[PDB]
Design a protein around this nucleic acid. Structure first.
Ligand SMILES: [Ca+2]
Ligand SMILES: [Ca+2]
Ligand SMILES: [Ca+2]
Length: 223
DNA sequence: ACGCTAGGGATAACCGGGTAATAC
DNA sequence: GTATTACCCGGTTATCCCTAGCGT
């Protein structure tokens, strides 16, 4: 076998890299479980072939989170996160951090769940059959936040920013969250698009499930 | 008198395209 | 010359927080 340190700065078509890639067969349980939450959240899973391999591309303002995800997928990630500096239409500078895994058939398992016929969809019983506490944690860290951002608020209600999904898809996600994790949640409307509202009653239930997996610099998102 | 939420707006992300670097 | 592909880019906007001023 080959150590990552030996390949991480070779060319894309380097034979040693391909030999390093061939040693890896599957995502570990943690990378797959977190992957579910990430693809529900801020993650871009893509194929350049016809579904033979997939990679995940990442972009985040939060560098520490980017770092944490890169460490989680360490064996799949050759490069540190690269700084992305861009200029707005208003003239403002915008900083974010970019990273990607290399492409690999091990990522097909994640893609098969969501990417059917070249389009990001949600399967019927996704939450019920796949979403673990770890998945929920990464989903929250990607899409999660407060319902009440007022200073000195007593409201402990959570929001999951699911605006890219259809109303029907989000309803199914709600049905799952309620049945599997006993969360008192329902669909609400922002910009004529769906979000998931988790009531303040269920705050402790939600927080206890995800606490093992969240990082300090993502705690600001919690009420 | 003030908890709460619909609506605002500049991002913080998603999404594909291009290319520099091996192999043959 | 062609295939290969990880690390960038830049086009876009649905996010992701902030708050007006509604409702009681
Ligand atoms: Ca998202
Ligand atoms: Ca996010
Ligand atoms: Ca988006």
């Amino acid at each position: 076998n080959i150590k990552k340190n030996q390949v991480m700065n070779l060319g894309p078509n380097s034979k040693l890299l391909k030999e390093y890639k061939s040693q890896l067969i599957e995502l570990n349980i943690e990378q797959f479980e977190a992957g579910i939450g990430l693809i529900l959240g801020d993650a871009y899973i893509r194929s350049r072939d016809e579904g033979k391999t997939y990679c995940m591309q990442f972009e985040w303002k939060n560098k520490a989170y980017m770092d944490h995800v890169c460490l989680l997928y360490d064996q799949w990630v050759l490069s540190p996160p690269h700084k992305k500096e861009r200029v707005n239409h208003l003239g403002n500078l915008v900083i974010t951090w970019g990273a990607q895994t290399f492409k690999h058939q091990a990522f097909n398992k994640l893609a098969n769940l969501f990417i059917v016929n070249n389009k990001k969809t949600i399967p019927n019983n996704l939450v019920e059959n796949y979403l673990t506490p770890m998945s929920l944690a990464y989903w929250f860290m990607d899409d999660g936040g407060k319902w009440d951002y007022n200073k000195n608020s007593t409201n402990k209600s959570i929001v999951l920013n699911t605006q890219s999904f259809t109303f029907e898809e989000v309803e199914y996600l709600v049905k799952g969250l309620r049945n599997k994790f006993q969360l008192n949640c329902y669909v609400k409307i922002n910009k004529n698009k769906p979000i998931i509202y988790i009531d303040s009653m269920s705050y402790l239930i939600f927080y206890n499930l995800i606490k093992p997996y969240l990082i300090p610099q993502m705690m600001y998102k919690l009420p």
